[PDB]
Design a protein around this ligand. Structure first.
Ligand SMILES: O=C(O)[C@H](O)[C@@H](O)[C@H](O)[C@H](O)COP(=O)(O)O
Ligand SMILES: O=C(O)[C@H](O)[C@@H](O)[C@H](O)[C@H](O)COP(=O)(O)O
Ligand SMILES: [Fe+3]
Lengths: 185, 187
């Protein structure tokens, strides 16, 4: 029997005690943002951190669970909001649940069929990511967007398809938040 | 195939209520044979049969890889000197894990293996508890205010209340000048 345990989540910083920290900067997201120019610039300008993850994962097993907080920093590449890479589950069949804790943003989801959905998120918002849906998180505010994510330990990660094809939509700023089609999709 | 639609639902940090969720209520009369002081139990039922806890759940069809989630509002109180608590259970597919995220109030979680080995983890706002496969779990409110938390579990985990309704937990959580976890006499 594995040992149960408790860990403290700081509602202000989004940091989970004893978690495994991962960091993703702009230089780690080449080929994701539409404005390749503005991208290249910002990188040489300082290669700012886009988001950080604090994860506690179990071994890949059916029926088990992993969880992690993400701190998605405010910003835009051109006029495209800072976002996570986005991914499907290796076992695409796996669902996921997100719980927004601080700031504001939204999640962009897409199916293999091609359907695209955008769900706005504010503190208190619980987002249900169904089986087969790829999903990416976007920060539409000027402050850090913090959320907790819980997912099957055997769900796995499939980034390839997204890095290749990309999402059928992009989330940009045009006075307000606009969800429009993605040219290179 | 025809996919299920994603969705966002609001959770009220202050009330523990989740919009559009399925509500369940458990009164003291719904927990007959759970508390050690059965005389104190009887008296409290006739005096008003208070609500011990309420659950707001959103569940999918019991299918592999999917997820259910629910909040619980566990009210403050005691039967004799035993803190208000949930019935407690093992998952139907016993090797399914679960994750709790405390949002308001103070309490703790009591866990045990099929063999009776127990663990008690304190919970306060911000505490995340990992319930490993095979462990039964019960939540306890050790405070004077509602203890609110969010729980996430596999949609095919199911519920096994039988063993516990029968033999209870190997331990009880009571107040004696403070919070104490002692052996369960009728266990
Ligand atoms: O698997 C996970 O750990 C969760 O889905 C979540 O923590 C996610 O990883 C981050 O938001 C980073 O975004 P991406 O992993 O989609 O690039
Ligand atoms: O299955 C669930 O829905 C969750 O584990 C949780 O919401 C639990 O039901 C309540 O905390 C009440 O506890 P009991 O189900 O043991 O009475
Ligand atoms: Fe459960």
């Amino acid at each position: 029997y594995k040992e149960p345990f408790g860990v403290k989540l700081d509602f202000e910083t989004g940091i989970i005690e004893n978690a495994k920290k991962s960091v993703r900067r702009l230089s780690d997201m080449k080929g994701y943002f539409i404005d390749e120019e503005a991208w290249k610039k910002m990188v040489e300008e300082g290669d700012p951190v886009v988001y950080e993850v604090y994860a506690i994962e179990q071994e890949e097993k059916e029926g088990d669970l992993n969880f992690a907080t993400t701190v998605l920093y405010p910003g835009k590449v051109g006029n495209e909001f800072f976002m996570t890479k986005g991914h499907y589950h290796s076992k695409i069949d796996r669902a996921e649940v997100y719980f927004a804790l601080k700031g504001k943003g939204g999640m962009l989801l897409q199916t293999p069929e091609g359907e695209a959905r955008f769900i706005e998120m504010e503190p208190g918002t619980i987002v249900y990511v169904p089986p087969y849906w790829a999903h990416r998180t976007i920060n539409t505010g000027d402050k850090p967007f913090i959320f907790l994510a819980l997912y099957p330990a055997d769900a796995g990660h499939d980034y390839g398809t997204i890095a290749e094809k990309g999402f059928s939509k992009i989330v940009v700023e045009e006075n307000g938040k606009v969800v429009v089609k993605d040219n290179p999709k």
